[PDB]
RNA sequence: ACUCGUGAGAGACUGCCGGGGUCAACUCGGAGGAAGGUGGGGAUGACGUCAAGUCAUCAUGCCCCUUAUGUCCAGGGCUUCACACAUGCUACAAUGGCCGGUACAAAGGGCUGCGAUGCCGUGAGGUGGAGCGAAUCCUUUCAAAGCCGGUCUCAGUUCGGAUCGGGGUCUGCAACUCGACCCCGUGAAGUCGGAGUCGCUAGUAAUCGCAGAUCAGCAACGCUGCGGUGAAUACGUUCCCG
């Protein structure tokens, strides 16, 4: 996977670390990734306890996956962003293994929104 | 390009400089700062130290580059590749 | 914007009225007709000797109070930011919000 | 000889008031009128951006509307003229005498 | 004499009807020199057809504003109004045909932020 | 369409043929609002058909429509969280719309060097039952029949 | 018809056939046809031999086309290159020479896109 | 007299009729009418959210510079290019290209500005200045798509116009970096575009032209408006998004 990182100000080595960490997420995505962008920003105010902000955006075959984190330095922000992206990709999977427990089962046991409605005759059963 | 009625444009500084330069038939390096001045057939032998943004690059005039500007021969941006 | 630049704009205007009124306009009248002998006259060279600030081409319509150089309106001489605020307060006669 | 009396004002009621008061005074002096002939309203429109920074898609429109009335008299007796230059009008409305 | 007007989206038509033949005088030009489109001619002559008074009224018309289609629509409304003025007791026939209704369809105002009246700028999620 | 059906536009009868369907055809072939060119194309095609066959163009055009009009069409249906191709009966208006759209498109992909000749040839072959629109109707009917197992829902 | 070594198109109108000459576009062909006197709508298979001759000597007389034009253009470009002017090294490295943007566009000078 | 311009007013209120309705809200249909059920479109954006944006419109607490992070000037840069993303324009043509004739708009702008007739150029344009603070004059009397006639004959072409060579015009003190336009020549990719994705329910989408602000000039194919021609479709909420 190819990632372009648009940092700002002073963050030496943040671009390379973010690139190498994010590029490892291609195998986790179950569909081809069309685009992947990362942005690193730092808060000017020293009063901020977590100044560094990292944002990511992945185009998973038309499905947009994004996350945003805060950290005290570039490495921690990148690692937390990787964790959040992994969780989002896990929740997006949508392949059969990810939607086999949600497909309605049985015949009369259990009901879901998309469950097949029961067929009813014209006359009351009696 | 500049309209023909106005004629070619040359700054007065280097104009008087080259007139006093060619009156005794000796051509030393002339240090200049008007990149916008056109080449006139009175420059054929004179060597110009035209500005670049950082320094002055020697420009030795010929018959070929008459009618251009001193600016085309002092390349400003430097690019070597990625 | 910056006080120095607000002032320098005015200084250009007084320079323009002093010089561009006749000096930087008679030379143009000389250069207009090809019949007029411009080449030996050096009306080009004479008009180069004049200060650059004589030329109105160096002028800039700034906001009359604010000094804002962009988003200017010639009817009011005011920035888009200031026009919006004074029209809302009913300061410019015969100006109101639109509907059609 | 007839002279043109031209009114231009930003406020409709003001210019209508001035027009009726002017026809009243010229009729007092004994002059023939044509009536306050209406003229097309002049509309000047300007579009501005609401926010100081960015947000171009949000715009605000303004206009300035100028209303015009035309007064023409006849038989310019000097009494009507002396009355004409002795009229007080709201500052909003201007008069053009030709 | 009798004179009515027809208006259709910025097209204004003044009509002067006299009981002569079926000569159509549109600003000194005939129905063929003007309106060289058969659909426009049918739209023009529809009120006459439903009233069956074809070729018994010399028509003089003043045309200004809009295009050929708007001019034709306004002209048709003009003949409908002139006919309703000439023979009142045909109002059912013209009205149920809709020829007595001014069409209130005008060019929608262009809106800021949108390229056209309703067209919106292309938006990219990625 | 969440709150109910929308009213239909009552387009007018054609002046020079007096039929609803030719107006529907000119609106189908219309591009960019150039209505005059669309009517010229349609009228030229109808006159070419009249010249070739020697009879009224409206009757042969109607014959082409009935030859390409579909009756059974397949739509994807999601019942009980599963999607299948379900054959569905087609209303008369939709069948006419589909037939006209097929005719216009398949005439646009012909090779007769001009739209008028392409359209005339397509209507003639549909009237005789050899056009590509007739074929397309055959395949859509075949697909509807082949999925008859899912007709119960 | 062989015209200044150029095989004319088999069946074309005269001026547009003459456009095929490397030194002639549409205006040049129109004016030379008008001045020399041949019809402008007649096809290229209707030329007689003397018509070919009159076109030939007229064109060699008051026009410059084919190899001489190509070599003059090449020499002009080379001379512009060798004097070290801005257009010189612009020609040397295959980039647009008239101030066109190069951040995104200018694939015509850059050739086909390459991936690095 | 008829339009039109701009002032005042009337006119749609479930006002009436019939049916459902708790005889209640409300709803369906009909009459009248230009318009029927908040007629169409605007302006108007509740408490708050996202420490959303703006210390570069402006103001401002605190900190910092003050022989400088202030201030003046010339030159350069913001236009750099192996690439990536995004918004657009032009095309890939015959529902078209080119040539000739010919018909219909609205809105808006103009004083050291609009600038006509005329004359000179092929054309940008040049000379000249009529009349206009403008329902008057100029923007041509205003358009283009449109209609008619001729030609091209399915080709990387009479498509497409990039790039490049030469020659000019205008503005500006000055078009080298780095303006626009005009003429001659040159004639690239491009054969309708993968995964995926966007806008739009009617005078709408599509398409065509016109104007304005900024502005000496323009990078305007951008933005804000104006009118011309004008469709298809909606079975219905299972799925996607909010």
From Swiss-Prot, chain C:
This is Small ribosomal subunit protein uS14A. HAMAP family: Ribosomal_uS14_1. InterPro entries: Ribosomal_uS14, Ribosomal_uS14_bac/plastid. Belongs to the universal ribosomal protein uS14 family. Keywords: Ribonucleoprotein, Ribosomal protein, RNA-binding, rRNA-binding. Coiled coil: none annotated. The gene is rpsN. Part of the 30S ribosomal subunit. Contacts proteins S3 and S10. GO terms for cellular component: small ribosomal subunit. One of its GO terms (molecular function) is structural constituent of ribosome. Gene3D superfamilies: 1.10.287.1480. GO terms for biological process: translation. Pfam families: Ribosomal_S14. Binds 16S rRNA, required for the assembly of 30S particles and may also be responsible for determining the conformation of the 16S rRNA at the A site. The keyword Cell membrane does not apply.
UniProtKB/Swiss-Prot annotation, chain D:
GO terms for biological process: translation. It comes from the Bacteria. It comes from Mycolicibacterium smegmatis (strain ATCC 700084 / mc(2)155). Belongs to the universal ribosomal protein uS10 family. This is Small ribosomal subunit protein uS10. Part of the 30S ribosomal subunit. GO terms for molecular function: structural constituent of ribosome; tRNA binding. InterPro entries: Ribosomal_uS10 (IPR001848), Ribosomal_uS10_CS (IPR018268), Ribosomal_uS10_dom (IPR027486), Ribosomal_uS10_dom_sf (IPR036838). One of its GO terms (cellular component) is ribonucleoprotein complex.
Curated annotation (Swiss-Prot), chain F:
Transmembrane segments: none annotated. GO terms for molecular function: rRNA binding; structural constituent of ribosome; tRNA binding. The keyword Metal-binding does not apply. It holds the Pfam family Ribosomal_S7. Keywords: Ribonucleoprotein, Ribosomal protein, RNA-binding, rRNA-binding, tRNA-binding. It comes from the Bacteria. One of its GO terms (cellular component) is small ribosomal subunit. GO terms for biological process: translation. The keyword RNA-binding applies. Coiled coil: none annotated. NCBIfam families: rpsG_bact. Part of the 30S ribosomal subunit. Contacts proteins S9 and S11. Belongs to the universal ribosomal protein uS7 family. One of the primary rRNA binding proteins, it binds directly to 16S rRNA where it nucleates assembly of the head domain of the 30S subunit. Is located at the subunit interface close to the decoding center, probably blocks exit of the E-site tRNA. This is Small ribosomal subunit protein uS7. It comes from Mycolicibacterium smegmatis (strain ATCC 700084 / mc(2)155). The gene is rpsG.
UniProtKB/Swiss-Prot annotation, chain G:
GO terms for biological process: translation. Coiled coil: none annotated. Keywords: Ribonucleoprotein, Ribosomal protein, RNA-binding, rRNA-binding, tRNA-binding. InterPro entries: Rbsml_uS13_C (IPR027437), Ribosomal_uS13 (IPR001892), Ribosomal_uS13-like_H2TH (IPR010979), Ribosomal_uS13_bac-type (IPR019980), Ribosomal_uS13_CS (IPR018269). GO terms for cellular component: cytosol; small ribosomal subunit. Residues 94-116 are annotated as: Disordered. One of its GO terms (molecular function) is structural constituent of ribosome. It comes from the Bacteria. NCBIfam families: uS13_bact (TIGR03631). Part of the 30S ribosomal subunit. Forms a loose heterodimer with protein S19. Forms two bridges to the 50S subunit in the 70S ribosome. Located at the top of the head of the 30S subunit, it contacts several helices of the 16S rRNA. In the 70S ribosome it contacts the 23S rRNA (bridge B1a) and protein L5 of the 50S subunit (bridge B1b), connecting the 2 subunits; these bridges are implicated in subunit movement. Contacts the tRNAs in the A and P-sites. Belongs to the universal ribosomal protein uS13 family. This is Small ribosomal subunit protein uS13. The lineage of its organism: Bacteria, Bacillati, Actinomycetota, Actinomycetes, Mycobacteriales.
């Amino acid at each position: 996977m190819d990632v372009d990182v648009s940092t700002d100000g002073e963050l030496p080595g943040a671009a390379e670390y973010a690139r190498e960490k994010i590029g490892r997420l291609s195998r986790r995505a179950h569909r081809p990734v069309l685009h992947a962008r990362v942005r690193l920003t730092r808060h000017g105010d020293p009063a901020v306890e977590r100044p560094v902000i990292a944002q990511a955006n992945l185009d998973v075959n038309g499905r947009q996956v994004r996350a945003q984190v805060e950290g005290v330095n570039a490495r921690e922000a990148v690692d937390r962003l990787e964790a959040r992206l992994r969780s989002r990709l896990e929740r997006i999977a949508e392949h059969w293994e990810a939607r086999r427990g949600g497909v309605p089962a049985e015949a009369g046991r259990e009901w879901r929104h998309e469950s097949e409605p029961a067929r009813r005759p014209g006359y009351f059963p009696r | 390009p500049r309209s023909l009625k106005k004629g070619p444009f040359v700054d007065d500084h280097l104009l008087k400089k080259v007139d006093v330069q060619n009156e005794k038939n000796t051509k030393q390096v002339i240090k200049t700062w008007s990149r916008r001045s056109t080449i006139i057939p009175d420059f054929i032998g004179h060597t110009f130290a035209v500005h670049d943004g950082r320094k002055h690059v020697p420009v030795f005039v010929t018959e070929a580059m008459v009618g251009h500007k001193l600016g085309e021969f002092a390349p400003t941006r430097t690019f070597k590749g990625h | 914007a910056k006080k120095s630049k607000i002032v320098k704009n005015e200084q250009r205007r007084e320079l323009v009225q002093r010089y561009a009124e006749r000096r930087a306009e008679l030379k143009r009248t000389i250069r207009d007709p090809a019949s007029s002998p411009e080449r030996r006259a050096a009306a080009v060279s004479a008009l180069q000797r004049l200060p650059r600030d004589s030329s109105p081409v160096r002028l800039r319509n700034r906001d009359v109070v604010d000094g804002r150089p962009r988003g200017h309106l010639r009817k009011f001489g005011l920035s888009r930011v200031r026009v919006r605020e004074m029209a809302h307060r009913g300061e410019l006669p015969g100006v109101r919000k639109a509907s059609w | 000889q007839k002279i043109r009396i031209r009114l231009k004002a930003y406020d409709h009621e003001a210019i209508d008031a001035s027009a009726r008061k002017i026809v009243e005074t010229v009729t007092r002096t004994g002059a023939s009128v044509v009536g306050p002939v209406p003229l097309p309203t002049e509309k000047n429109v300007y579009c501005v951006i609401r926010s100081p920074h960015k947000y171009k898609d949000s715009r605000e429109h303004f206009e300035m509307r100028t209303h015009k009335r035309l007064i023409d008299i006849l038989d310019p007796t000097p009494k009507t003229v002396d009355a004409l230059m002795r009229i007080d009008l709201p500052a909003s409305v201007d008069v053009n005498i030709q | 004499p009798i004179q009515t007007v027809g208006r259709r989206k910025e097209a204004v038509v003044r009509v002067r009807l006299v009981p002569g033949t079926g000569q159509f005088n549109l600003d000194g030009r005939t129905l063929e020199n003007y309106f060289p489109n058969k659909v426009h001619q049918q739209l023009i002559k529809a009120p006459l057809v439903t009233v069956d008074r074809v070729d018994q009224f010399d028509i003089y018309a003043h045309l200004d504003g809009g295009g050929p289609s708007g001019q034709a629509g306004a002209l048709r409304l003009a003949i409908a109004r002139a006919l309703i003025l000439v023979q009142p007791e045909d109002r059912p026939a013209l009205k149920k045909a809709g020829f007595l209704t001014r069409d209130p369809r005008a060019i929608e105002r262009k809106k800021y932020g949108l390229k056209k009246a309703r067209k919106a700028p292309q938006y990219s999620k990625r | 369409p969440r709150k109910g059906p929308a009213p239909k536009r009552p387009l007018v009868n054609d002046p020079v043929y007096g039929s609803q369907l030719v107006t529907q055809l000119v609106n189908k072939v219309l591009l960019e609002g150039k209505k005059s060119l669309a009517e010229r194309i349609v009228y030229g095609a109808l006159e070419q058909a009249r010249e070739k066959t020697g009879t009224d163009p409206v009757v042969t055009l109607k014959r082409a429509l009935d030859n390409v009009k579909p009756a059974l069409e397949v739509r994807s249906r999601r019942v009980g969280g599963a999607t299948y191709q379900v054959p569905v009966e087609v209303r008369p208006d939709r069948s006419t719309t589909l037939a006209l759209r097929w005719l216009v498109n398949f005439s646009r992909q012909r090779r007769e060097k001009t739209m008028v000749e392409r359209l005339a040839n397509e209507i003639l072959d549909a009237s005789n039952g050899l056009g590509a629109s007739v074929k397309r109707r055959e395949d859509t009917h075949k697909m509807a029949e082949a999925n008859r197992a899912f007709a119960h829902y | 018809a062989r015209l200044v070594g150029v095989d004319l198109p088999r069946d074309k109108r005269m001026e547009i056939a003459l456009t095929y000459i490397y030194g002639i576009g549409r205006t040049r062909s129109n004016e030379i046809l008008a001045a020399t006197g041949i019809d402008k709508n007649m096809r290229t298979k209707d030329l007689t031999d003397d018509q070919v001759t009159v076109l030939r000597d007229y064109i060699e007389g008051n026009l410059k086309v084919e190899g001489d034009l190509r070599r003059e253009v090449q020499a002009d470009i080379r001379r512009k290159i060798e004097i070290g002017c801005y257009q010189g090294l612009r020609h040397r490295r295959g980039l647009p020479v008239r101030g066109q943007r190069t951040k995104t566009n200018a694939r015509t000078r850059k050739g086909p896109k390459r991936t690095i």
